[PDB]
């Protein structure tokens, strides 16, 4: 219900109003406005021709760590009925109020019943089997090796690696059942969807414009197709663009068939400099169901390494999802460039952090969990297993792209805050 | 004041509530909720543990074109007093209600007075001299060739190219005065700041976390510095990462000194595939005051080309600002992947478009202006000069990065809308 001083200053500048003029237009005290840089908010919004939400400060300020005990986690249990049976139990892990919470599921569909599919969800997720039992994953109506596979639990001696993991692909329906008699739990961890802000906007476009967008995005989205959109944007043709960059038409065509060859790169960067765009977005990403990201217990075992005071093993990952991360951590300083979500699987562990009130700590037992904000310095003590998940748009890989395009990004951020 | 069905569905899924459960929790009719997919909004927000703004539909739906007559533009005139004199006149061009409007300025500070600097602004801008007179640009307290330069007007015969143009760099203070007796106007066109969403979030972090972020962003932001953050994020060291990718430690070091060599690229892409990140953000952007983007009348003349039915010439651009575009267009179909802002400089021109109610058109005289939404198909008729400006986060270059990382992006967008 508060006013963001950074958003307010933005809108005043956008309208080219001084503080005095703004207070005058809004009919409020100038000292009040200077301090801000409930009844004020509506007047300010109207004076600056914006919606109240456009001036609204975040509901959470100076968050560092949020935590949730095993007891609180167990208390959050909600049964899910599906296909005439008690199908899952659903529990939530630590997250800031209002944010999407990581989920633990009891898998209750028995081995002799095909698990009814959900509707899918936009956000991708890392799902890992916590065990103790093997489970079936289902990804299609018909039951084939492509749509039906066992997500194993670790039955052996290094249980800190709990089981198989994979990435649930965006939007595709899925479900789980027990592979046998033994019970099982999973963690499914969603990252923010990076295509969501585009879709939110595209949803409000006219149907005509939307159809035009889908045409431009249909088929193979290549260096050439994207470049042609960049050129049209700048009122250029391939002919005029190559001439502007001082590049032969044949060398441009060659670059577009091999963008990631350092000659292809040279041509595209030269064109980008001449025309005012970033060549990096023209470079190839890997061609795009569960087999690629699938990570076995063995895979994770093979990945084991020392990471400072910890031992670490990898869960599933995808190069097309750089913001979504998962690791097994054995405990016996941590700082990330975005958010972390942790859940204890073994031991009575202490999470320590430095926050606005100095050194702080919390003790967590299995099923206990925590969240850390971007760049919150922290560490774990005790002995010693926690699952480490990561998500967040800030700083996300798209932010990294922009930051490399920024002169003195630290100075820019400092200016924004004071 | 309406509810976005796409945001509502998102939050229900996030909480794992069915429609029936959601209506039940919110204490509203299930048919009402099914239709939505004022009194409902508050209850829904509370039930779904979100702020009302998080469910709010955009205030503008199905916008295609907005326009503003020369008369309406002239009527918007606002004087700006600075340093004891009438310093500018400020006019606004067509923009959707609430959005940042492009600005035209009368330059009124005389040649014998040094123009007092403003405070700067986060957003970069293309500024172009409309003439008829030359102007002084100022970019520093002391007057040096680096901080003081004439932005010329075209005095010759191809006036559709109106004058010199350049990019106002982010945050640096600037001002303008007349170079002589002749009066002058400029257009200054701002694009959205792509670092703004990061700063908005960073502003709400604890001071401790903020200081840690600035440390990680200080100095040279290189392939190696960014990679090391990516590795720490995944609980990897350079040693374990290279082993995971099956790459020799010496080949990784070599790649980080030459990321844009197709061997450097090969190593980084291999590491990105193995560890689950996008190598493209590790590749170099050009090293980063006014001299680089400065575009003379001659420059623009040299750039002239046929673009369909139009003749086009380039204004200033910057490779580190891919979303910000400007062109001179001579008139005697257009579709862009983001927003356009147009201002007529000569002739009585017709802008035609296809919108929700079929073919539409508007006639515009000099100073008349228009805005087009992303992918709105349009065309100009008549004879024949308009300035074409472009901005917008959607689809911006960061969206393009994500879209190349998406399986069947058109199918994803279609699903989001229905």
Tab-separated table of C-alpha atoms in Angstrom, chain A:
chain	number	residue	atom	x	y	z
A	1	UNK	CA	0.000	0.000	0.000
A	2	UNK	CA	3.144	2.175	-0.077
A	3	UNK	CA	4.578	4.317	-2.893
A	4	UNK	CA	7.799	3.296	-4.659
A	5	UNK	CA	10.058	6.394	-4.744
A	6	UNK	CA	11.813	4.991	-7.824
A	7	UNK	CA	8.553	4.518	-9.762
A	8	UNK	CA	7.268	7.938	-8.662
A	9	UNK	CA	10.465	9.685	-9.818
A	10	UNK	CA	10.226	7.812	-13.122
A	11	UNK	CA	6.698	9.039	-13.841
A	12	UNK	CA	7.430	12.628	-12.839
A	13	UNK	CA	10.417	12.641	-15.213
A	14	UNK	CA	8.328	10.993	-17.967
A	15	UNK	CA	5.747	13.780	-17.669
A	16	UNK	CA	8.534	16.363	-17.176
A	17	UNK	CA	7.001	17.683	-13.929
A	18	UNK	CA	9.057	19.096	-11.092
A	19	UNK	CA	8.211	18.093	-7.505
A	20	UNK	CA	6.495	21.464	-7.004
A	21	UNK	CA	4.352	21.007	-10.134
A	22	UNK	CA	3.473	17.419	-9.211
A	23	UNK	CA	2.334	18.344	-5.680
A	24	UNK	CA	0.411	21.283	-7.215
A	25	UNK	CA	-1.337	19.083	-9.802
A	26	UNK	CA	-2.092	16.342	-7.263
A	27	UNK	CA	-3.291	18.911	-4.698
A	28	UNK	CA	-1.073	17.588	-1.915
A	29	UNK	CA	1.624	19.091	0.396
A	30	UNK	CA	5.045	19.492	-1.232
A	31	UNK	CA	6.807	18.262	1.930
A	32	UNK	CA	4.731	15.059	1.733
A	33	UNK	CA	5.833	14.491	-1.869
A	34	UNK	CA	9.489	15.187	-1.045
A	35	UNK	CA	9.214	12.618	1.765
A	36	UNK	CA	7.655	10.068	-0.619
A	37	UNK	CA	10.649	10.502	-2.958
A	38	UNK	CA	-3.070	6.574	1.355
A	39	UNK	CA	-5.076	9.555	0.024
A	40	UNK	CA	-1.914	10.856	-1.668
A	41	UNK	CA	-1.605	7.763	-3.886
A	42	UNK	CA	-4.894	8.201	-5.794
A	43	UNK	CA	-4.219	11.903	-6.447
A	44	UNK	CA	-0.639	11.196	-7.570
A	45	UNK	CA	-1.802	8.453	-9.942
A	46	UNK	CA	-4.386	10.753	-11.529
A	47	UNK	CA	-1.968	13.699	-11.796
A	48	UNK	CA	0.676	11.494	-13.447
A	49	UNK	CA	-1.883	9.743	-15.710
A	50	UNK	CA	-0.992	6.280	-14.392
A	51	UNK	CA	-2.708	3.400	-12.597
A	52	UNK	CA	-2.142	3.188	-8.812
A	53	UNK	CA	-0.329	-0.154	-9.345
A	54	UNK	CA	2.259	1.696	-11.457
A	55	UNK	CA	3.357	3.687	-8.384
A	56	UNK	CA	2.994	0.836	-5.876
A	57	UNK	CA	6.021	-0.282	-3.873
A	58	UNK	CA	6.607	-4.014	-3.441
A	59	UNK	CA	4.753	-5.653	-0.535
A	60	UNK	CA	8.041	-7.213	0.612
A	61	UNK	CA	11.058	-5.016	1.324
A	62	UNK	CA	14.414	-6.089	2.773
A	63	UNK	CA	13.623	-9.808	2.749
A	64	UNK	CA	16.710	-11.962	3.229
A	65	UNK	CA	15.642	-15.390	4.447
A	66	UNK	CA	12.272	-17.031	5.005
A	67	UNK	CA	12.042	-20.442	6.661
A	68	UNK	CA	9.454	-23.136	7.460
A	69	UNK	CA	9.770	-25.925	10.039
A	70	UNK	CA	9.150	-29.621	9.308
A	71	UNK	CA	6.037	-29.305	11.508
A	72	UNK	CA	4.704	-26.303	9.532
A	73	UNK	CA	5.433	-28.161	6.309
A	74	UNK	CA	3.522	-31.237	7.560
A	75	UNK	CA	0.675	-28.968	8.736
A	76	UNK	CA	0.248	-27.633	5.179
A	77	UNK	CA	-0.853	-31.076	3.896
A	78	UNK	CA	-3.771	-30.945	1.452
A	79	UNK	CA	-5.298	-34.062	-0.126
A	80	UNK	CA	-5.966	-34.060	-3.878
A	81	UNK	CA	-8.762	-36.289	-5.207
A	82	UNK	CA	-8.497	-37.380	-8.849
A	83	UNK	CA	-10.136	-40.171	-10.885
A	84	UNK	CA	-12.224	-41.277	-7.865
A	85	UNK	CA	-9.297	-41.806	-5.486
A	86	UNK	CA	-7.075	-39.931	-3.073
A	87	UNK	CA	-4.366	-39.256	-5.689
A	88	UNK	CA	-1.805	-36.952	-4.051
A	89	UNK	CA	-0.995	-35.201	-0.818
A	90	UNK	CA	0.299	-31.681	-1.422
A	91	UNK	CA	2.678	-29.813	0.924
A	92	UNK	CA	4.299	-26.392	0.520
A	93	UNK	CA	7.892	-25.408	1.352
A	94	UNK	CA	9.234	-22.001	2.481
A	95	UNK	CA	8.593	-19.031	0.187
A	96	UNK	CA	7.975	-15.318	0.717
A	97	UNK	CA	4.295	-14.534	1.301
A	98	UNK	CA	2.427	-14.422	-2.012
A	99	UNK	CA	5.190	-16.077	-4.035
A	100	UNK	CA	4.943	-19.502	-5.680
A	101	UNK	CA	5.945	-22.113	-3.088
A	102	UNK	CA	7.925	-25.276	-3.948
A	103	UNK	CA	5.803	-28.402	-3.582
A	104	UNK	CA	6.250	-31.864	-2.124
A	105	UNK	CA	3.792	-34.548	-3.231
A	106	UNK	CA	2.893	-37.890	-1.705
A	107	UNK	CA	2.413	-40.199	-4.697
A	108	UNK	CA	-0.749	-42.190	-3.858
A	109	UNK	CA	-2.005	-43.604	-7.178
A	110	UNK	CA	-1.241	-47.354	-6.898
A	111	UNK	CA	0.835	-49.363	-9.399
A	112	UNK	CA	-2.206	-51.105	-10.932
A	113	UNK	CA	-3.958	-47.860	-11.893
A	114	UNK	CA	-2.784	-45.637	-14.761
A	115	UNK	CA	-2.405	-42.152	-13.267
A	116	UNK	CA	-4.848	-39.649	-14.795
A	117	UNK	CA	-3.006	-36.738	-16.467
A	118	UNK	CA	-3.177	-33.109	-15.328
A	119	UNK	CA	-3.682	-30.184	-17.746
A	120	UNK	CA	-0.009	-29.104	-17.854
A	121	UNK	CA	1.411	-25.729	-16.811
A	122	UNK	CA	3.398	-23.019	-18.569
A	123	UNK	CA	6.298	-23.071	-16.095
A	124	UNK	CA	8.985	-25.727	-16.463
A	125	UNK	CA	9.869	-27.746	-13.347
A	126	UNK	CA	12.636	-29.955	-12.012
A	127	UNK	CA	10.958	-33.006	-10.430
A	128	UNK	CA	13.010	-35.350	-8.261
A	129	UNK	CA	12.065	-38.610	-6.577
A	130	UNK	CA	12.664	-38.414	-2.816
A	131	UNK	CA	11.854	-42.116	-2.405
A	132	UNK	CA	11.831	-44.503	-0.746
A	133	UNK	CA	9.856	-46.135	-3.592
A	134	UNK	CA	10.209	-46.065	-7.383
A	135	UNK	CA	7.472	-44.203	-9.270
A	136	UNK	CA	5.996	-44.126	-12.768
A	137	UNK	CA	6.058	-40.887	-14.708
A	138	UNK	CA	3.395	-40.423	-17.370
A	139	UNK	CA	3.581	-37.883	-20.250
A	140	UNK	CA	0.946	-38.986	-22.783
A	141	UNK	CA	-2.446	-40.612	-23.271
A	142	UNK	CA	-1.062	-43.798	-24.860
A	143	UNK	CA	1.430	-45.818	-22.808
A	144	UNK	CA	4.741	-46.074	-24.723
A	145	UNK	CA	8.436	-45.974	-23.687
A	146	UNK	CA	8.303	-42.297	-24.727
A	147	UNK	CA	5.327	-41.469	-22.496
A	148	UNK	CA	5.860	-43.871	-19.562
A	149	UNK	CA	9.065	-44.331	-17.542
A	150	UNK	CA	10.153	-45.193	-13.997
A	151	UNK	CA	11.625	-42.385	-11.927
A	152	UNK	CA	13.791	-44.496	-9.593
A	153	UNK	CA	14.548	-43.915	-5.945
A	154	UNK	CA	18.037	-44.603	-4.609
A	155	UNK	CA	17.937	-47.962	-2.791
A	156	UNK	CA	21.707	-47.959	-2.160
A	157	UNK	CA	24.081	-46.361	0.355
A	158	UNK	CA	24.502	-42.711	-0.720
A	159	UNK	CA	20.950	-41.560	-0.009
A	160	UNK	CA	21.842	-37.876	-0.108
A	161	UNK	CA	21.301	-38.452	-3.840
A	162	UNK	CA	17.623	-39.306	-3.373
A	163	UNK	CA	16.609	-40.512	-6.859
A	164	UNK	CA	16.187	-39.801	-10.576
A	165	UNK	CA	15.266	-36.311	-11.755
A	166	UNK	CA	14.072	-34.649	-14.973
A	167	UNK	CA	12.562	-31.405	-16.316
A	168	UNK	CA	8.790	-31.329	-16.794
A	169	UNK	CA	8.448	-29.604	-20.187
A	170	UNK	CA	6.315	-26.461	-20.515
A	171	UNK	CA	2.562	-27.095	-20.935
A	172	UNK	CA	2.680	-30.861	-21.538
A	173	UNK	CA	0.280	-32.870	-19.295
A	174	UNK	CA	1.839	-35.228	-16.740
A	175	UNK	CA	1.148	-37.435	-13.715
A	176	UNK	CA	2.732	-39.954	-11.346
A	177	UNK	CA	1.843	-43.262	-9.704
A	178	UNK	CA	3.710	-45.773	-7.538
A	179	UNK	CA	5.799	-48.317	-9.459
A	180	UNK	CA	5.223	-50.882	-6.698
A	181	UNK	CA	4.108	-51.287	-3.099
A	182	UNK	CA	6.673	-48.929	-1.526
A	183	UNK	CA	5.420	-45.368	-0.864
A	184	UNK	CA	7.098	-42.329	-2.484
A	185	UNK	CA	7.387	-38.542	-2.402
A	186	UNK	CA	8.607	-36.080	-5.013
A	187	UNK	CA	9.717	-32.490	-4.980
A	188	UNK	CA	8.603	-30.517	-8.000
A	189	UNK	CA	10.285	-27.139	-8.306
A	190	UNK	CA	8.996	-24.557	-10.781
A	191	UNK	CA	10.976	-21.608	-12.141
A	192	UNK	CA	9.350	-18.399	-13.385
A	193	UNK	CA	8.334	-18.529	-17.032
A	194	UNK	CA	10.496	-16.165	-19.073
A	195	UNK	CA	7.960	-16.093	-21.922
A	196	UNK	CA	5.144	-15.099	-19.573
A	197	UNK	CA	5.604	-11.294	-19.772
A	198	UNK	CA	5.456	-11.543	-23.593
A	199	UNK	CA	2.283	-13.665	-23.458
A	200	UNK	CA	0.628	-11.367	-20.904
A	201	UNK	CA	1.123	-8.503	-23.383
A	202	UNK	CA	0.315	-10.527	-26.506
A	203	UNK	CA	-3.002	-11.551	-24.900
A	204	UNK	CA	-4.064	-7.873	-24.982
A	205	UNK	CA	-3.153	-7.308	-28.647
A	206	UNK	CA	-5.854	-7.232	-31.314
A	207	UNK	CA	-6.582	-10.624	-32.897
A	208	UNK	CA	-5.142	-9.322	-36.187
A	209	UNK	CA	-1.810	-8.360	-34.608
A	210	UNK	CA	-1.674	-11.636	-32.637
A	211	UNK	CA	-2.127	-13.682	-35.826
A	212	UNK	CA	0.655	-11.682	-37.488
A	213	UNK	CA	2.949	-12.421	-34.516
A	214	UNK	CA	2.250	-16.159	-34.691
A	215	UNK	CA	3.070	-16.098	-38.442
A	216	UNK	CA	6.431	-14.440	-37.746
A	217	UNK	CA	7.120	-17.050	-35.028
A	218	UNK	CA	5.952	-20.125	-36.970
A	219	UNK	CA	8.225	-22.809	-38.442
A	220	UNK	CA	11.995	-22.615	-38.011
A	221	UNK	CA	13.031	-19.520	-36.059
A	222	UNK	CA	16.490	-19.059	-37.597
A	223	UNK	CA	19.288	-16.483	-37.798
A	224	UNK	CA	17.845	-15.426	-41.169
A	225	UNK	CA	14.205	-15.201	-40.064
A	226	UNK	CA	15.125	-13.163	-36.960
A	227	UNK	CA	17.569	-10.960	-38.901
A	228	UNK	CA	14.918	-10.175	-41.534
A	229	UNK	CA	12.632	-8.943	-38.752
A	230	UNK	CA	15.508	-6.798	-37.386
A	231	UNK	CA	16.096	-5.344	-40.866
A	232	UNK	CA	12.414	-4.560	-41.559
A	233	UNK	CA	12.336	-2.864	-38.141
A	234	UNK	CA	15.130	-0.538	-39.304
A	235	UNK	CA	13.644	0.014	-42.782
A	236	UNK	CA	16.469	-2.019	-44.322
A	237	UNK	CA	16.557	-4.866	-46.854
A	238	UNK	CA	19.317	-7.526	-46.921
A	239	UNK	CA	20.894	-5.554	-49.800
A	240	UNK	CA	20.988	-2.185	-48.024
A	241	UNK	CA	22.067	-3.748	-44.695
A	242	UNK	CA	25.098	-5.517	-46.203
A	243	UNK	CA	26.062	-2.265	-47.984
A	244	UNK	CA	25.733	-0.270	-44.746
A	245	UNK	CA	28.025	-2.727	-42.935
A	246	UNK	CA	30.458	-2.858	-45.878
A	247	UNK	CA	29.846	-6.609	-46.231
A	248	UNK	CA	29.395	-8.547	-49.526
A	249	UNK	CA	25.861	-10.018	-50.029
A	250	UNK	CA	27.415	-13.492	-50.434
A	251	UNK	CA	29.214	-13.204	-47.073
A	252	UNK	CA	25.926	-12.312	-45.352
A	253	UNK	CA	24.182	-15.382	-46.823
A	254	UNK	CA	27.135	-17.564	-45.725
A	255	UNK	CA	26.973	-16.153	-42.189
A	256	UNK	CA	23.257	-16.952	-41.930
A	257	UNK	CA	23.863	-20.617	-42.825
A	258	UNK	CA	26.658	-20.818	-40.203
A	259	UNK	CA	26.069	-18.125	-37.521
A	260	UNK	CA	28.257	-19.867	-34.904
A	261	UNK	CA	31.363	-20.095	-37.106
A	262	UNK	CA	33.748	-17.282	-36.068
A	263	UNK	CA	33.448	-15.997	-39.645
A	264	UNK	CA	29.639	-16.102	-39.390
A	265	UNK	CA	30.021	-14.379	-36.023
A	266	UNK	CA	32.362	-11.731	-37.515
A	267	UNK	CA	29.841	-10.782	-40.241
A	268	UNK	CA	26.858	-10.698	-37.870
A	269	UNK	CA	28.681	-8.628	-35.235
A	270	UNK	CA	29.813	-6.222	-37.974
A	271	UNK	CA	26.211	-5.906	-39.189
A	272	UNK	CA	25.016	-5.455	-35.582
A	273	UNK	CA	27.488	-2.627	-34.987
A	274	UNK	CA	26.492	-0.844	-38.201
A	275	UNK	CA	22.726	-1.217	-37.738
A	276	UNK	CA	22.396	-1.028	-33.941
A	277	UNK	CA	21.464	-4.518	-32.749
A	278	UNK	CA	22.920	-7.328	-30.621
A	279	UNK	CA	24.276	-10.182	-32.795
A	280	UNK	CA	24.183	-12.624	-29.870
A	281	UNK	CA	20.429	-13.268	-30.172
A	282	UNK	CA	20.971	-14.464	-33.767
A	283	UNK	CA	23.277	-17.277	-32.672
A	284	UNK	CA	21.969	-20.857	-32.474
A	285	UNK	CA	20.474	-22.501	-29.420
A	286	UNK	CA	20.200	-26.310	-29.326
A	287	UNK	CA	17.377	-27.849	-31.390
A	288	UNK	CA	14.413	-28.820	-29.241
A	289	UNK	CA	10.502	-34.953	-24.614
A	290	UNK	CA	11.874	-36.380	-21.332
A	291	UNK	CA	14.945	-38.322	-22.499
A	292	UNK	CA	17.221	-35.320	-22.983
A	293	UNK	CA	17.002	-33.873	-19.458
A	294	UNK	CA	16.519	-37.231	-17.684
A	295	UNK	CA	19.109	-37.547	-14.887
A	296	UNK	CA	19.636	-40.941	-13.227
A	297	UNK	CA	20.972	-41.693	-9.746
A	298	UNK	CA	24.148	-42.895	-11.561
A	299	UNK	CA	24.376	-39.604	-13.481
A	300	UNK	CA	24.155	-37.682	-10.225
A	301	UNK	CA	26.714	-39.994	-8.545
A	302	UNK	CA	29.109	-39.428	-11.455
A	303	UNK	CA	28.659	-35.655	-11.089
A	304	UNK	CA	29.794	-35.579	-7.426
A	305	UNK	CA	32.329	-32.873	-6.529
A	306	UNK	CA	33.712	-30.823	-3.668
A	307	UNK	CA	32.137	-27.370	-3.575
A	308	UNK	CA	33.837	-25.464	-0.740
A	309	UNK	CA	32.819	-27.152	2.537
A	310	UNK	CA	30.105	-29.170	0.770
A	311	UNK	CA	29.850	-32.175	-1.498
A	312	UNK	CA	27.526	-31.517	-4.461
A	313	UNK	CA	25.739	-33.582	-7.108
A	314	UNK	CA	23.701	-32.404	-10.099
A	315	UNK	CA	19.991	-32.827	-10.709
A	316	UNK	CA	18.466	-32.476	-14.177
A	317	UNK	CA	19.084	-29.271	-16.142
A	318	UNK	CA	18.368	-27.836	-19.596
A	319	UNK	CA	20.424	-25.332	-21.577
A	320	UNK	CA	17.188	-23.722	-22.827
A	321	UNK	CA	16.228	-23.100	-19.194
A	322	UNK	CA	19.270	-21.273	-17.719
A	323	UNK	CA	17.346	-19.827	-14.771
A	324	UNK	CA	16.218	-23.230	-13.394
A	325	UNK	CA	18.766	-25.112	-11.235
A	326	UNK	CA	18.901	-28.085	-8.861
A	327	UNK	CA	21.625	-29.704	-6.751
A	328	UNK	CA	22.018	-32.261	-3.986
A	329	UNK	CA	24.192	-30.808	-1.196
A	330	UNK	CA	25.951	-32.834	1.492
A	331	UNK	CA	26.888	-30.941	4.658
A	332	UNK	CA	29.687	-32.089	7.007
A	333	UNK	CA	29.935	-19.323	2.257
A	334	UNK	CA	27.138	-19.458	-0.292
A	335	UNK	CA	26.044	-16.594	-2.466
A	336	UNK	CA	23.906	-16.892	-5.589
A	337	UNK	CA	23.028	-14.340	-8.259
A	338	UNK	CA	19.300	-15.137	-7.839
A	339	UNK	CA	16.878	-16.908	-5.446
A	340	UNK	CA	17.452	-20.221	-3.654
A	341	UNK	CA	14.955	-22.674	-2.182
A	342	UNK	CA	16.340	-25.302	0.207
A	343	UNK	CA	14.789	-28.417	1.750
A	344	UNK	CA	16.494	-30.574	4.387
A	345	UNK	CA	16.399	-34.308	3.717
A	346	UNK	CA	18.677	-35.477	6.543
A	347	UNK	CA	20.012	-34.180	9.835
A	348	UNK	CA	19.460	-31.222	12.111
A	349	UNK	CA	21.018	-28.427	10.075
A	350	UNK	CA	21.706	-24.776	10.844
A	351	UNK	CA	21.227	-22.140	8.174
A	352	UNK	CA	23.084	-18.932	8.956
A	353	UNK	CA	22.808	-15.623	7.155
A	354	UNK	CA	23.716	-11.965	7.471
A	355	UNK	CA	20.673	-9.705	7.318
A	356	UNK	CA	19.540	-6.169	8.271
A	357	UNK	CA	19.757	-7.018	11.987
A	358	UNK	CA	23.182	-8.709	11.801
A	359	UNK	CA	23.984	-12.458	12.013
A	360	UNK	CA	20.876	-14.651	12.115
A	361	UNK	CA	20.268	-18.399	12.144
A	362	UNK	CA	17.605	-21.097	12.084
A	363	UNK	CA	17.775	-24.826	12.818
A	364	UNK	CA	15.962	-27.139	10.392
A	365	UNK	CA	15.122	-30.843	10.475
A	366	UNK	CA	14.158	-33.036	7.471
A	367	UNK	CA	11.210	-31.495	5.571
A	368	UNK	CA	12.214	-28.110	7.026
A	369	UNK	CA	12.935	-25.555	4.326
A	370	UNK	CA	14.254	-22.093	3.547
A	371	UNK	CA	14.326	-19.392	0.879
A	372	UNK	CA	17.163	-16.940	0.219
A	373	UNK	CA	16.881	-13.689	-1.779
A	374	UNK	CA	19.359	-12.856	-4.562
A	375	UNK	CA	22.908	-12.222	-3.267
A	376	UNK	CA	22.038	-13.076	0.349
A	377	UNK	CA	25.240	-14.489	1.853
A	378	UNK	CA	24.599	-17.688	3.818
A	379	UNK	CA	26.039	-21.018	4.926
A	380	UNK	CA	24.946	-24.383	6.316
A	381	UNK	CA	26.359	-26.080	9.405
A	382	UNK	CA	25.723	-29.579	10.796
A	383	UNK	CA	25.608	-33.069	9.241
A	384	UNK	CA	24.225	-32.995	6.593
A	385	UNK	CA	21.892	-33.197	3.546
A	386	UNK	CA	19.890	-30.452	1.807
A	387	UNK	CA	18.422	-30.073	-1.692
A	388	UNK	CA	19.297	-26.743	-3.319
A	389	UNK	CA	16.913	-25.306	-5.919
A	390	UNK	CA	17.281	-22.056	-7.849
A	391	UNK	CA	14.981	-19.805	-9.859
A	392	UNK	CA	14.263	-16.092	-10.401
A	393	UNK	CA	14.181	-13.491	-13.183
A	394	UNK	CA	16.704	-11.315	-11.297
A	395	UNK	CA	19.413	-11.722	-12.015
A	396	UNK	CA	18.296	-14.111	-14.761
A	397	UNK	CA	20.131	-14.929	-17.999
A	398	UNK	CA	18.155	-12.219	-19.820
A	399	UNK	CA	19.397	-9.671	-17.228
A	400	UNK	CA	22.945	-10.900	-17.912
A	401	UNK	CA	22.452	-10.158	-21.620
A	402	UNK	CA	21.385	-6.568	-20.780
A	403	UNK	CA	24.106	-6.058	-18.142
A	404	UNK	CA	26.847	-6.859	-20.685
A	405	UNK	CA	25.213	-4.126	-22.823
A	406	UNK	CA	25.440	-1.594	-19.968
A	407	UNK	CA	28.105	1.020	-19.281
A	408	UNK	CA	29.052	0.877	-15.580
A	409	UNK	CA	26.077	-1.271	-14.458
A	410	UNK	CA	27.058	-0.993	-10.775
A	411	UNK	CA	26.945	2.827	-10.983
A	412	UNK	CA	23.530	2.594	-12.670
A	413	UNK	CA	22.121	0.380	-9.920
A	414	UNK	CA	23.555	2.625	-7.182
A	415	UNK	CA	21.910	5.692	-8.770
A	416	UNK	CA	18.561	3.850	-8.896
A	417	UNK	CA	18.627	3.120	-5.158
A	418	UNK	CA	19.599	6.595	-3.873
